[PDB]
Amino acid sequence: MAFNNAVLQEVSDLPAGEVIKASPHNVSAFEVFQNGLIEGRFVKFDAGSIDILDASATPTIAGIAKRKVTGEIGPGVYSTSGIEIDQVAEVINFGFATVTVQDAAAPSKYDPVYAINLDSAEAGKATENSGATGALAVADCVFWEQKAANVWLVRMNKFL
Amino acid sequence: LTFLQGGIVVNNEGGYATSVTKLKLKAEGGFRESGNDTNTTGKITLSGESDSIP
Amino acid sequence: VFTLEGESDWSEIELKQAELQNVNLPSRYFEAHAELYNRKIDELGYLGQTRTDG
């Protein structure tokens, strides 16, 4: 159908899955990954492949799925075997990066980031509330500032 | 006849194709308050979407 | 001596839709006619003419 949101009230800030390159930053390419890897989410590393967060024991959070500016137009999705095939999964593991947050979450600066660990659409979403279902403490990462609607720029103190 | 007098322009670009696809680029981001020698935490970037009419 | 005759037709619509792929549909039919004539000349000298009923 027509273009969504003809006129927006404010200019939306950084979309999720984006890394600021003024600060020190590292986005590292993983060749093997999971089809349908949502961008702008925390992604885990399992069996030598970058895949979506899902209920597990203690997933190895490898960082934030980088949003490709020159990727396919559509939902933020990493795809294999299509016209929109993405050869590698670009993952932001160091620096300031934008991640979607649970719509219930209301975080603030220097709050410890919690990723979502569920087999649902909310997989890989950040949050401040640790009592949220499937709240996984991401090691050494803090919310920095609210960029967009339900998107927060967080800071990964060390590599993820 | 009232349509074309309303003001809607007629766009003869679609060629012979069975559908016309239009694409929209939106600038997303924001300038952030900075000091003399700091690292900017505000980034201006692009996003897009598309539509198709048969 | 017997004669073989074959047709090929198109339309401006599909002519231009084929030109979309930089394909000259009339020229392509002419090449196909010549190639099928060559193939039939090759086959008639090897297997003769099979009637359409077998």
Binding site: V69, G74, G76 | - | -
Partner: peptide, 24 residues
Amino acid sequence: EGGIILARNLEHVSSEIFTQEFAG
């Protein structure tokens, strides 16, 4: 969200056209 490049532009349909070949 997603990207800026429409999917069909991320594919280069080769200008070379390969005709079908038959026995000699």
